Amino acid sequence: AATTVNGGTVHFKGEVVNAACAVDAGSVDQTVQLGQVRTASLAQEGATSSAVGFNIQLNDCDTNVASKAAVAFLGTAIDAGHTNVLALQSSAAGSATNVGVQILDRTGAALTLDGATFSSETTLNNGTNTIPFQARYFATGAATPGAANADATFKVQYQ
Amino acid sequence: AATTVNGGTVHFKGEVVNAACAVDAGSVDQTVQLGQVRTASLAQEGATSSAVGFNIQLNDCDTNVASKAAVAFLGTAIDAGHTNVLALQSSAAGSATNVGVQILDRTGAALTLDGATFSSETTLNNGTNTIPFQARYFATGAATPGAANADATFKVQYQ
Amino acid sequence: AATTVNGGTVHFKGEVVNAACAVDAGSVDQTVQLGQVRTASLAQEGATSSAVGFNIQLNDCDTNVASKAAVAFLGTAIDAGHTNVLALQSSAAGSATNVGVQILDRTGAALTLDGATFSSETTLNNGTNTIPFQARYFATGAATPGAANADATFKVQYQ
Amino acid sequence: AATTVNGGTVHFKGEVVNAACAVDAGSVDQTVQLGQVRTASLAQEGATSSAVGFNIQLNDCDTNVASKAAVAFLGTAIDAGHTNVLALQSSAAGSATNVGVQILDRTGAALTLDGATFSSETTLNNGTNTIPFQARYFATGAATPGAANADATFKVQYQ
Amino acid sequence: AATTVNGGTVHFKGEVVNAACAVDAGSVDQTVQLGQVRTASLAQEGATSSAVGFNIQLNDCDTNVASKAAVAFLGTAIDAGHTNVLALQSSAAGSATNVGVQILDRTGAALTLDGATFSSETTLNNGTNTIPFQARYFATGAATPGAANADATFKVQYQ
Amino acid sequence: AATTVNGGTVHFKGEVVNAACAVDAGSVDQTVQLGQVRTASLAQEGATSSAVGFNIQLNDCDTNVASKAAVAFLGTAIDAGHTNVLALQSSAAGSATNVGVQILDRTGAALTLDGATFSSETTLNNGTNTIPFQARYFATGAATPGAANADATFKVQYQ
C-alpha cells in the first residue's frame, strides 16, 4: 500500500561569482521596514526623517586576493536635480508625492544612484563580513499622505 | 585589478501619514506566538484560555494636535453569532475547529472585528507611547486538534 | 602575524528627554520576583497576599526646574469592575485564574491602570531620588493553581 | 477631528493539541547561542567541545492523564555513520567543514536524529515542568574555519 | 509645569500553588558562588572538594495540611555511570573537563539528578522553614583548567 | 497509550574560528542599556554625558600562539567630521537629533568607527580574559528629545 501522490515543485535560486567573497543568501533579496512618518516632519525641501539601518554580509572572504570592498546602488532618481534620491513605486494611484528615499554610506553621506559611484572602502578579514548602511526619507517639496515603497539593486567591487 | 560582480536587491517598505503620531517600524507587521493549548481546556461553548500580550508603539507624538488615541481591528469573524472572534486560516487541511482568537482591550473587554468599533481611549504624551493588548483562544463548541493561525489589521483614530 | 577574526554585535538602548530628572539605567527595565503564593490565602474576592517592594530611581534631578514628581502606570485590567488590578499574561495555557496583580503607592492605595491617574506627589532634591512602590496579589474569586506573570509601563510627571 | 489613519497587520501563531501538557509559547521556536570555538580544539574525528544548555518547558500538566514524558529530535544527519550528529546549514558558501552539532539527553548521551528514538523519560508533576538539554560541537576530521548554524525539530511523547 | 515623560517597563514574576508551604522569593532563583578550586586536589576519579552551603526557604507553612517536606533535583548528568553529578555548561569553549558538580543532602549523601528520587524528609513547623544543602566538585578523571558553571531545578514534595 | 504530538523548532547559532581565543556566547550578541539623558546636559557641540560600561569576554585563550589582543569597531558615522561618533537608528519617525554614541577604550580615548583602527592592546593570560569598554552620548549641537538606539559590530586581532 504505497499510495503515491503528487507533491509539488521546488525552485532554486543562486549565482556563481569569480570574486574574493560571496554575498550571503539572506542579503541577496531583503525587505527593510521603515515605518510610518508624519507629514509635519516633512514640510520643505531638504527635510529628512530618522534613519533605519540594514546590513549586507560577505561570506568566505579571502584577504590574499582582495583587501577592500565597496558597494554601489542603482535605481530611478526622483528627478534630474536630485541624483541621490530614490523614487516611490507602488501602483498607479496611492503613492505619496514630493518625497523620496536616500541611502546613507558608512560615513553618513548620501550615495548617488547611478550604478557607478561606489561607497567608501572597508577593510576585510577572512571569514564573515558585514557592511553597515542606513536609509531615510528626503522631502523635495510639501509632502502629502500616501504609500512609500522603493526598490534598488547593488553591485560589489573587490580590489 | 578591481573585480566587480552583481549583488542583489533591496526592497523598502513604508508609509506617510497626516496624523499626530507614527506607528513604530517594529509594530507595522509583527507575529505573536500564542503557544499550544490542550483540548481539555476547551470543552464547551464560551470556554477560554490564558492570554498572551502584545503592544503597539507610537512614536513622535505631539499633544498640541491630539491628546487621545484608539485602535480598531478588522478581520474575518468565525460566525454570524460571534462577531468578536477571529477565524483560523492556515491552509485547506489541518486546522482546528470550533475555536477562534479573541483580542482584548486594555479594559479586559473583547473587540468587535468590524473596523468601526474603536477601543477605549488612552491619554498620550510627547514622545514614545505604548498601548497594551492581549489575545486568547475562544471555544465555540468542542475543540479538535489542529493548527491555529490568524491575521488581522488595525487602524488608529487620533481624537 | 595579525590573525584577525570576526567578533560580534553590540546593541545600545537609550532615550533623550527634556525634563528635570532622568530615569536610571537599571530602572528602565526591571524584573520583580513575587514568589509563590498558596491558594489557601486566596479563597474569595477581595483577598490579598503579602507585598513585595520595588522602587524607581531618578538621576541628575534639578530643583530649579521642578519640585515634585508622580508616576502613572498603564496596563491591561482584569475586567471592567476592577480597574486597579493587572491581568496575567504568560502563554496560552498554564496561567492562574481569578487572580491579578495590584500596584500600591507610597500612600498605600492601589493605582488605576489607565495611564492618566498619577500617584501621590513626592518632593525631590538635587542629585539622586528614589520613589518606593509595592506589588501584591489580588484575588477576584476562587483562585486556581498556575503561573502568574505580568507587565506594565509607567510615565513620569514633573509638576 | 477623528483623523483616522491606516495601521498595520498582526499575525497570530499557535496550535491545539490533545495531550496531557502543552508546550510553552517561549519554547516552540527558540534560538541557542553556542558561541565561537577554536579550530585547535577540533583536530581529529570524535573530538568534542564544551556544552551549552537549553530547556523545553511544559505547561498545564495533568498527572492523571499521563505521568512521564520524552522527546525525540528530527534533522539532517551529517553522514551515514554519524546519525547522531546534526549537519550545518547556513548558506551556499562560508560554512565550517567536518564538524556538526550534537544534542545530549539528560543522561549525558547523544540522541539519534531520526524522529523515532525518544530520549529518557522524566516524571511530571501538576503545573509547569522543565526538561534540560545540552548542545555541543562534534568534529568528524580536521575542522575548517567558517560559520556553524543548524536547525532541528522535536516531538513529545506523553506516555 | 506639567511635563510628562515616558518611563520604562516593569516585569512581574510569580506562581500560585496549591500546597502547604510556598517558596520564598529569594529562593526561586539564586546563584551560588563556589569559587576557584586547584586542579592539584582533583587528580583522579572520586576526588572531591570542599563544600559550599545554600538554603531553600519555605514561607507560610501549615502543620495541618502537611508535616514533612522533601525536594528532588533535575539536571543533565555527566555520564551514564555518574547519575548524581551535574555537567558543566557555560559556552562552547573554555570549560573544564572531567569535573562535575555534586549536590549533597542534609544527611550527607548525594542525590540522583533524575527529578524523581527525593531527599530525606524534614519536619516542618508553622511559619518559616529552611532546608540546608551543600555543593561540591567531583572529578571523573584528570581535571583540566576552565569554567565550572552549572544549573539545575528542584521540585518540592509535601507529605 | 503513547499520544505523540508535535513540538517545535530549535535554532542553533555559532561560529568556528582559527585564533588564539574564542568569544564567549554571552558577548557575541549583547544589549547595553544606557538609560535616559536630559537635554540640559547636551546643549553645545562636544558636550558628553556620563558613561556606561560593558565587557567583551574571551575564552580558552592560549599564551603560546599569541599574547596580546585588540578590538576594532565598525558602524555608521554621524558626519564626515565626526568619524568617532555612532549614528542613531531605531525607526523613521522618532529619534534624537544632533546626538550620537561614542565608544571609549580602556585608555579613555574614543575609537574611530571604520573597522581598521584597532584599540589599545591588552596582555592576555591562559583561561578567561575580559576587556573593558565604555559608552556615552555625544552632542553635535542642540539636542532634541527622542529615542537613542544604535548598533555596532566589532572584530578581534590576536597579534
Side-chain angles (χ1 to χ4, degrees):
Chain A
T3 312
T4 304
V5 299
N6 185 51
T9 308
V10 192
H11 306 245
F12 304 109
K13 306 289 182 193
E15 186 169 2
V16 166
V17 287
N18 186 294
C21 308
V23 178
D24 175 58
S27 298
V28 300
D29 200 58
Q30 62 181 354
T31 68
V32 188
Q33 283 272 1
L34 301 189
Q36 290 189 356
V37 175
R38 293 176 63 237
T39 56
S41 62
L42 291 185
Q44 74 264 0
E45 193 272 334
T48 59
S49 72
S50 299
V52 186
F54 57 102
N55 304 309
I56 300 183
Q57 291 182 356
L58 301 183
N59 307 137
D60 210 3
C61 282
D62 185 4
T63 51
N64 288 301
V65 192
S67 78
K68 298 291 212 65
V71 178
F73 289 78
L74 173 71
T76 288
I78 195 67
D79 62 354
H82 297 117
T83 55
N84 48 359
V85 185
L86 283 171
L88 307 185
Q89 55 181 11
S90 297
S91 171
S95 303
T97 53
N98 295 303
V99 293
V101 174
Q102 264 170 351
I103 291 172
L104 316 163
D105 195 7
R106 177 172 67 74
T107 64
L111 290 174
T112 297
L113 304 156
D114 57 357
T117 307
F118 281 83
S119 86
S120 46
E121 295 183 359
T122 295
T123 52
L124 302 176
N125 59 8
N126 295 61
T128 311
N129 291 315
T130 306
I131 303 183
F133 282 109
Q134 287 191 357
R136 67 179 177 185
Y137 291 110
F138 178 83
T140 300
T144 62
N149 320 126
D151 281 0
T153 71
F154 61 86
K155 53 181 53 171
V156 181
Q157 193 183 62
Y158 302 110
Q159 65 90 30
Chain B
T3 310
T4 317
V5 299
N6 191 51
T9 317
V10 192
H11 301 242
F12 299 111
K13 295 283 184 298
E15 177 148 297
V16 181
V17 292
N18 186 359
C21 303
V23 184
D24 189 56
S27 303
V28 173
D29 201 300
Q30 62 180 355
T31 64
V32 184
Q33 284 273 1
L34 274 77
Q36 299 185 357
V37 64
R38 302 174 59 238
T39 57
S41 165
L42 295 179
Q44 70 272 15
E45 193 272 334
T48 54
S49 69
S50 308
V52 185
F54 64 100
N55 294 303
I56 297 184
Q57 162 166 350
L58 312 172
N59 301 311
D60 206 3
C61 284
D62 183 5
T63 48
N64 276 353
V65 187
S67 73
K68 283 190 173 162
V71 172
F73 285 84
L74 173 71
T76 300
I78 195 181
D79 190 63
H82 296 117
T83 313
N84 46 359
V85 192
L86 282 172
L88 309 185
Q89 58 175 13
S90 55
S91 175
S95 181
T97 50
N98 297 303
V99 295
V101 177
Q102 276 190 298
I103 291 169
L104 308 168
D105 197 7
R106 82 157 173 69
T107 70
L111 280 183
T112 305
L113 310 155
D114 57 356
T117 68
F118 278 85
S119 84
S120 45
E121 298 203 299
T122 300
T123 54
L124 303 177
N125 61 10
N126 297 290
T128 304
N129 289 313
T130 317
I131 303 191
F133 285 106
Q134 281 185 356
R136 70 186 175 192
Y137 289 115
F138 184 82
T140 63
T144 301
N149 318 305
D151 287 296
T153 53
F154 56 87
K155 64 179 73 175
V156 182
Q157 171 181 353
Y158 293 106
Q159 198 180 354
Chain C
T3 311
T4 315
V5 300
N6 188 54
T9 302
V10 189
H11 299 245
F12 300 108
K13 300 292 183 182
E15 169 172 358
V16 179
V17 301
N18 182 289
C21 301
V23 188
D24 191 56
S27 298
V28 171
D29 184 285
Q30 60 178 307
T31 303
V32 184
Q33 192 72 55
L34 270 299
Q36 298 187 358
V37 63
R38 303 173 57 235
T39 59
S41 58
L42 296 182
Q44 73 273 16
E45 192 196 61
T48 52
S49 68
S50 315
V52 175
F54 72 96
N55 45 5
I56 306 294
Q57 161 162 348
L58 311 181
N59 292 357
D60 202 1
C61 282
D62 183 6
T63 55
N64 309 296
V65 183
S67 159
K68 289 177 140 294
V71 171
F73 281 98
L74 177 67
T76 296
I78 191 181
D79 56 59
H82 294 119
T83 53
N84 46 2
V85 193
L86 190 61
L88 309 179
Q89 58 184 12
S90 68
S91 171
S95 297
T97 307
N98 294 301
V99 66
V101 172
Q102 268 207 358
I103 298 176
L104 316 163
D105 192 11
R106 81 171 179 68
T107 308
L111 301 178
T112 53
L113 300 172
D114 64 348
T117 78
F118 283 81
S119 81
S120 50
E121 300 195 299
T122 293
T123 72
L124 307 176
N125 64 75
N126 291 292
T128 300
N129 292 315
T130 63
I131 319 171
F133 284 104
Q134 275 192 356
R136 70 179 169 188
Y137 281 120
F138 183 103
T140 68
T144 79
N149 298 323
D151 299 297
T153 61
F154 62 89
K155 39 176 62 180
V156 192
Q157 184 177 63
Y158 295 105
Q159 203 180 0
Chain D
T3 312
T4 315
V5 303
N6 190 48
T9 318
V10 188
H11 304 247
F12 302 114
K13 296 288 162 44
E15 186 161 357
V16 189
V17 290
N18 186 358
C21 306
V23 188
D24 184 61
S27 292
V28 289
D29 193 297
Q30 62 180 354
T31 300
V32 184
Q33 191 69 236
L34 277 73
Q36 304 184 350
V37 59
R38 294 174 63 235
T39 50
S41 177
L42 296 179
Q44 71 273 15
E45 175 190 358
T48 64
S49 81
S50 303
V52 185
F54 69 94
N55 296 308
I56 313 288
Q57 164 174 349
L58 312 178
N59 299 307
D60 198 2
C61 278
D62 187 3
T63 55
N64 290 318
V65 182
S67 65
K68 268 172 164 296
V71 306
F73 284 82
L74 174 67
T76 287
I78 196 181
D79 198 0
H82 286 118
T83 49
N84 49 0
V85 180
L86 189 62
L88 305 181
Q89 58 182 1
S90 79
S91 178
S95 297
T97 306
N98 291 123
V99 63
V101 299
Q102 274 207 358
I103 301 172
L104 312 174
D105 194 7
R106 86 156 164 69
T107 65
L111 281 181
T112 303
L113 297 172
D114 56 352
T117 68
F118 283 74
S119 74
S120 48
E121 299 203 297
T122 302
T123 314
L124 304 185
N125 57 1
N126 296 299
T128 186
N129 277 292
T130 313
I131 309 185
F133 292 102
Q134 279 187 353
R136 65 184 180 182
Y137 289 114
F138 183 103
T140 58
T144 318
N149 321 314
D151 278 295
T153 45
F154 62 87
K155 57 177 58 172
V156 194
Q157 197 182 64
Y158 293 107
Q159 198 187 353
Chain E
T3 314
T4 317
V5 170
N6 184 54
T9 314
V10 186
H11 300 251
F12 304 108
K13 292 282 198 296
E15 198 180 306
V16 184
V17 306
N18 177 8
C21 305
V23 190
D24 188 62
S27 301
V28 174
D29 201 356
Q30 46 166 352
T31 313
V32 184
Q33 196 73 235
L34 277 73
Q36 310 188 357
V37 57
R38 295 177 59 237
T39 77
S41 53
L42 293 182
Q44 86 263 359
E45 184 178 2
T48 54
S49 165
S50 311
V52 178
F54 67 92
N55 296 302
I56 292 180
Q57 160 166 348
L58 313 178
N59 297 356
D60 200 2
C61 284
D62 188 358
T63 58
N64 285 2
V65 192
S67 177
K68 284 182 291 177
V71 308
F73 285 102
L74 170 72
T76 303
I78 192 168
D79 198 357
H82 295 297
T83 54
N84 46 0
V85 174
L86 280 171
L88 308 184
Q89 66 179 11
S90 66
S91 164
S95 185
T97 67
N98 295 298
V99 176
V101 167
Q102 210 164 6
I103 306 184
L104 315 171
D105 189 11
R106 87 161 165 70
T107 316
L111 307 181
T112 58
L113 301 167
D114 58 355
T117 69
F118 287 89
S119 66
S120 52
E121 285 159 356
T122 295
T123 316
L124 304 167
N125 56 5
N126 287 297
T128 304
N129 290 134
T130 63
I131 317 179
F133 290 104
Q134 271 181 357
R136 68 183 176 191
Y137 288 116
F138 186 83
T140 306
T144 63
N149 296 319
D151 274 294
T153 53
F154 62 89
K155 35 174 64 180
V156 189
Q157 187 201 62
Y158 303 109
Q159 198 206 358
Chain F
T3 307
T4 313
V5 296
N6 181 55
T9 304
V10 191
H11 299 282
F12 302 111
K13 297 262 166 289
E15 179 169 2
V16 178
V17 301
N18 183 3
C21 307
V23 192
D24 187 61
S27 299
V28 289
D29 195 0
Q30 62 180 354
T31 300
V32 183
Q33 191 73 55
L34 305 190
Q36 295 186 354
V37 60
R38 291 175 60 237
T39 57
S41 57
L42 291 189
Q44 314 100 9
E45 187 196 358
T48 56
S49 69
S50 304
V52 184
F54 62 99
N55 303 305
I56 306 293
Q57 179 174 301
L58 305 185
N59 293 354
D60 206 60
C61 284
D62 182 7
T63 57
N64 289 319
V65 296
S67 72
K68 303 176 78 59
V71 165
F73 277 97
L74 182 70
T76 288
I78 192 168
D79 199 355
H82 286 294
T83 52
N84 52 1
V85 182
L86 191 64
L88 305 178
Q89 58 184 1
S90 62
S91 172
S95 296
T97 316
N98 296 121
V99 183
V101 170
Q102 273 200 358
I103 295 178
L104 318 169
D105 193 10
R106 83 168 177 70
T107 314
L111 293 175
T112 300
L113 301 172
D114 75 308
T117 64
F118 281 76
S119 79
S120 58
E121 266 162 355
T122 297
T123 314
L124 312 171
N125 58 67
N126 296 292
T128 308
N129 292 315
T130 296
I131 313 177
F133 292 95
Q134 274 188 354
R136 68 177 176 191
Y137 291 115
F138 183 98
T140 309
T144 308
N149 298 321
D151 295 299
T153 185
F154 64 93
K155 44 172 67 177
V156 194
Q157 197 178 186
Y158 294 105
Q159 185 174 1

